[PDB]
Design a protein around this nucleic acid. Structure first.
Lengths: 114, 54, 52, 88, 95
RNA sequence: CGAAGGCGACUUUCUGGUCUGUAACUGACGCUGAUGUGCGAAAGCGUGGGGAUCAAACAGGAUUAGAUACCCUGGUAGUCCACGCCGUAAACGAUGAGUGCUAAGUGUUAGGGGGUUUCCGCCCCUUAGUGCUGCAGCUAACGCAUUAAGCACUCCGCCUGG
């Protein structure tokens, strides 16, 4: 089980959740990013993806996987403070992938915020 | 002459390396030179020789 | 899609933020937030480009 | 819309003299069969409205040749009215 | 009169002859019926760039047609999704 | 590119039409354009895919001194498209359409012209244009000045206090 996997996050503008999994997704543990008492304008922190990143990473305890190769699929304030700060656990982050959804003009997008 | 969409070798120096097409301004060609090269790109990109994204 | 190894994480963070920089990926999901009308999408295509 | 050999086919059978392209009769089978082309070709595409005035604006370009056929020589106009089928 | 040059692929886990006997059904479409076919560019091992039919290879097949009718490509266009061996086509024309 | 409303992943079908060049030919075969015929943006009258997203109307939470307002979503037709239109926009280049003539420079789109050549690139003639600066003339001035509101001709239409 150990030494391989994907630290599958999707770092949104609020509540960048972290789900560690394998290289074929099975989600050994995940972490809700509001687990540090972040409720309103608070999960958009560096620290929502610093310690709640390792509230499932340091508390993995199931595979003991060490090579993580974290993957991000969205923009957020805790994005650069997620891939750095999943390695706040010190879990040898190796291969970050910017495989984000880029639709070739996918649908009809919503309205401007006045 | 016209560039076919199988001579990628004199065509891939105009493409973007991570899936897209670089423009004509930074590539240094004319407009008909770009547009007939774009048909070679398009019939390579849409028809799986060049990809869209991976 | 860019793996940064044989180094520390700082230039890897400065690769990931640069791979974000040299991309129509984060700019595209910045482009695709809301709708601009085609009476005003050419205002972006002129005031940024016809002046360049 | 019209191919080169086909106009150069009708100059063999319907010209008034040698090198007589631009004749009144040399844009009648060129006109009305290309109508009959687009009459069936826009029967396929019911919204070929720009190709519709493509042949109608040259109806008058042939009609003004029929108009020019009056004043100079009228026996050529009795000839060319009775040559093919054109009303009025 | 018009020169149609379709570009299909086959399932690339094949041999040389049963590929050719498969496109012999296509030669009955895209080389007969007054086609006067100059060449048959049926390629071998290309790599399929994305995962169509989850394959490890890709065997590109450019076959020319030449008819003033355009039966052959659109016939095998109507055949393609129905059968389970053919995947692509890309016809082209030039004059 | 399209007259205009407009036109955008493409591969193909049927085409429109643009343009250059050689200019072969008919011997002005033209322009306006009342009538008439079309298109006609969006929304609205309705059908079938539509309610995935968006979203009038409606809803919820609080803010705020004030709500359900600026904040937010859920969400109805309407949306998307095809099937009928209505005949309306700042549909404005706020300049009707065809022809002669008077300072320039400057890019750029297509075709023809080349000099060196280039390892496909430098310089330059021309056409049609796409643009940007800029005389004389102009107006009340703005600003226009070869993609005239300058100097002339022809036609239609419109106007003469609010």
């Amino acid at each position: 089980n150990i030494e391989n996997g994907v630290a599958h996050i999707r770092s949104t503008f609020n509540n960048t959740i972290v789900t560690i999994t394998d290289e074929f997704g099975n989600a050994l543990s995940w972490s809700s990013a509001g687990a540090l008492g972040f409720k309103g304008s608070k999960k958009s922190t560096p620290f929502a993806a610093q310690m709640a990143s390792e509230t499932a990473s340091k508390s993995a305890m199931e595979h003991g996987l060490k090579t993580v190769e974290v993957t991000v699929k969205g923009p957020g304030p805790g994005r650069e403070s997620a891939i750095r700060a999943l390695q706040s656990a010190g879990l040898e982050v190796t291969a970050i992938r910017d495989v984000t959804p880029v639709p070739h003009n996918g649908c009809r997008p919503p309205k401007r915020r006045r | 002459t016209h560039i076919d969409y199988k001579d990628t070798e004199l065509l891939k120096r105009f493409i973007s390396e991570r899936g897209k097409i670089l423009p004509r301004r930074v590539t240094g060609t004319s407009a008909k030179y770009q547009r007939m090269l774009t048909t070679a790109i398009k019939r390579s990109r849409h028809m799986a020789l060049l990809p869209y994204v991976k | 899609t860019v793996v940064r190894k044989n180094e520390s994480l700082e230039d890897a963070l400065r690769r990931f933020k640069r791979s974000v920089s040299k991309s129509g990926t984060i700019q595209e999901v910045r482009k695709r937030e809301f709708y601009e009308k085609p009476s005003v999408k050419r205002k972006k295509k002129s005031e940024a480009a016809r002046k360049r | 819309a019209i191919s080169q050999e086909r106009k150069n086919e009708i100059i063999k059978e319907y010209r008034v003299h040698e090198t007589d392209t631009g004749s009144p009769e040399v844009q009648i089978a060129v006109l009305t069969a290309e109508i009959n082309a687009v009459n069936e070709h826009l029967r396929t595409h019911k919204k070929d409205h720009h190709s519709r005035r493509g042949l109608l604006k040259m109806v008058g370009r042939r009609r003004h040749l029929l108009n020019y056929l009056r004043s100079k020589d009228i026996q050529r106009y009795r000839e060319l009215i009775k040559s093919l089928g054109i009303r009025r | 009169m018009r020169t149609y040059e379709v570009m299909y692929i086959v399932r690339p886990n094949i041999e040389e002859d049963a590929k050719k006997a498969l496109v012999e059904r296509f030669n009955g479409i895209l080389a007969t019926e007054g086609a006067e076919v100059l060449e048959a560019k049926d390629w071998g091992k290309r790599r399929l760039a994305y995962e169509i039919n989850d394959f490890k290879d890709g065997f590109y097949n450019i076959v020319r047609v030449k008819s003033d009718n355009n039966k052959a490509t659109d016939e095998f266009q109507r055949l393609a999704k129905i059968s389970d061996d053919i995947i692509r086509y890309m016809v082209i024309r030039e004059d």
